[PDB]
C-alpha cells in the first residue's frame, strides 16, 4: 500500500505497508529434464561405431 | 500464365523438405540402412548440425 | 475370364508374416479393346500362356499345403537360421592367475601369457533353443504364394470356395472379420 505518488519522505510514508514476496523455487527439473535434447531431429545425439 | 503441368515450366522444386517412401505399411524403402538418414529421403535441411 | 481367368495376387503383411489378401492383377492388364481377331486371339494366347507359368512355378516352388495361407506355419516348413558353431578361444587361464597373483605377483594388460602354456577352447551353439515357427519372411512368401489361377471361379459348392483370398477371413473362425 503506498499511500502517496510523490517521492520524498513524509508523514503519508510512515502508513505504507509492506508485503513478502513471492516464495519462487528455482532448480533443474525433476530427473533433469531438459538438460538433454531428446527426439530432435536436428540436435540428434550419436552413439556409433568408430 | 504458363501451366507448368504442360509445358515443364517448373518452379516451386525447392519447397521440398522431405519424402518417405513406406511399401506394404510397414517396410520402408529402399530400406536397407541405404541413407545417412535410415528411413526417408530428406531432401533440405533449415537446421543442420550434424 | 473363367477359362483364361487373371490370377489372385497374393498381398503380403510383414508384421504378422502371413499374406493378407489375394485380389485379382487388374493392375497389369492388357488393353485389346481397340484390336481385332489378328490381335485378340493374340493376347489371348499370352494370357493363357502366363497361367501355364503360374502352374508351373507353383508346381515348383510352392510347399504342397491343405489350407491356402496358414495362420502359424510349422517349425520344420520356415526357413531358419543355422549357423556354424562359434569356436572361442579364451583368453586366461583362471587357476594359473590365482597362483601368480596369491604369491604377490599384480598381473596387468593383455601363449597370451609368458607364465601358462595352457589354452583353453570353447565351442557354443549359434542358433536358437527353440526352432522358430508361426510366420514366414518375405523370401518365403516370394516362394510360396506364387499368384493363384482359379480356373472356372465360384462354381464349386461354397465352402470349397477360396475364403483366404479375403483379408478379413479368419480360417479357425470361419468368419470375417469386424470392427470390433
Given at each position: 500500500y503506498m499511500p502517496t505518488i510523490k517521492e520524498g519522505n513524509s508523514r503519508e510514508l510512515m502508513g505504507q505497508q509492506?508485503?513478502?514476496?513471492?516464495?519462487?523455487?528455482?532448480?533443474?527439473?525433476?530427473?533433469?529434464?531438459?538438460?538433454?535434447?531428446?527426439?530432435?531431429?536436428g540436435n540428434m545425439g550419436v552413439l556409433a561405431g568408430q | 500464365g504458363s501451366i507448368p503441368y504442360l509445358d515443364g515450366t517448373f518452379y516451386l522444386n525447392h519447397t521440398f523438405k522431405k519424402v518417405a517412401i513406406t511399401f506394404d505399411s510397414s517396410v520402408s524403402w529402399p530400406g536397407n540402412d541405404r541413407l545417412l538418414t535410415p528411413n526417408e529421403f530428406e531432401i533440405k535441411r533449415s537446421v543442420d548440425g550434424e | 475370364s473363367k477359362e483364361i481367368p487373371t490370377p489372385y495376387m497374393w498381398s503380403y503383411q510383414p508384421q504378422?508374416?502371413?499374406?493378407?489378401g489375394a485380389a485379382q492383377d487388374y493392375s497389369t492388364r492388357i488393353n485389346y479393346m481397340s484390336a481385332g481377331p489378328h490381335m485378340i486371339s493374340r493376347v489371348n494366347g499370352i494370357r493363357a500362356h502366363r497361367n501355364r507359368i503360374l502352374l508351373e512355378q507353383a508346381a515348383i516352388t510352392t510347399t504342397p499345403?491343405?489350407?491356402?495361407?496358414?495362420?502359424?506355419?510349422?517349425?520344420?516348413?520356415?526357413?531358419?537360421?543355422?549357423?556354424?558353431?562359434?569356436?572361442?578361444?579364451?583368453?586366461?587361464?583362471?587357476?594359473?592367475?590365482v597362483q601368480m597373483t596369491n604369491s604377490g605377483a599384480q598381473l596387468a594388460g593383455g601363449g597370451r601369457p609368458s607364465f601358462t602354456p595352457r589354452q583353453a577352447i570353447l565351442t557354443l551353439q549359434t542358433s536358437s533353443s527353440e526352432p522358430r515357427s508361426g510366420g514366414i519372411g518375405t523370401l518365403q512368401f516370394i516362394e510360396e504364394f506364387v499368384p493363384s489361377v482359379y480356373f472356372n471361379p465360384f462354381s464349386g459348392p461354397p465352402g470349397h470356395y477360396p475364403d483366404q483370398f479375403i483379408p478379413n477371413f479368419d480360417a479357425v473362425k470361419d468368419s470375417a472379420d469386424g470392427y470390433d
Open positions: 509492506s508485503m513478502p514476496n513471492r516464495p519462487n523455487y528455482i532448480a533443474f527439473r525433476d530427473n533433469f529434464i531438459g538438460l538433454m535434447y531428446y527426439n530432435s531431429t | - | 504378422m508374416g502371413l499374406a493378407a499345403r491343405n489350407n491356402l495361407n496358414p495362420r502359424s506355419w510349422p517349425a520344420a516348413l520356415v526357413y531358419q537360421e543355422s549357423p556354424a558353431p562359434t569356436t572361442v578361444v579364451l583368453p586366461r587361464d583362471a587357476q594359473a592367475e
